[PDB]
Amino acid sequence: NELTWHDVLAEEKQQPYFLNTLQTVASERQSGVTIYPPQKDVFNAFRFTELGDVKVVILGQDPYHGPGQAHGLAFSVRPGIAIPPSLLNMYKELENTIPGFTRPNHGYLESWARQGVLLLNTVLTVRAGQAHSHASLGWETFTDKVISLINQHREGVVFLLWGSHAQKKGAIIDKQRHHVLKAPHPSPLSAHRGFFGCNHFVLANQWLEQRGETPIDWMPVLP
């Protein structure tokens, strides 16, 4: 689509739960609480992947909660940061399934986003060191609305729903209009229960080619 986030989120920006979330996060930053990612990065998934360009949606939960790590994309870390263990498991699955994929020397996934992979955490900020610390704000309400708008306004998006939380988040999606694939989370805590072998990266590309669209090149590139 020519559709943009601005076309469908302009009124959502004015909703009380959204305004209260931004105001709470801002007040915490002001009071000296370190919150990740930085304010300028919080909406980078939307900056890098416009609504009409979404081809694949991969949900996460929280941003990484250590210094310099999160930058507004699920799974990805800034250049120079050690590869997170869940992303390492994604790289292992990729190297086992995509012809010519080789282990990257970084974890920075902007180049996935620029190809139409929406790397959406369901909660968009976190206090330093403290997983789920911003879960009680309105981010899940916001990202529920984002998923509902992709479901409504697009056709044929691939959703890769990894783990229980992401699968529940995607329970609404129309499974005839879109292509929903489920597996365990790639975290070491669960990957051996079926993430390895899920073949989701190949399956997403097979769908895209059956739709007459270009596949994702899953090898990430440094800027």
């Binding site: 943009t4 986030w5 601005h6 989120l9 920006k13 300028k40 909406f43 939307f46 900056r47």
Partner: peptide, 4 residues
């Protein structure tokens, strides 16, 4: 900082 909001792209919409």
């Amino acid at each position: 900082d909001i792209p919409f």
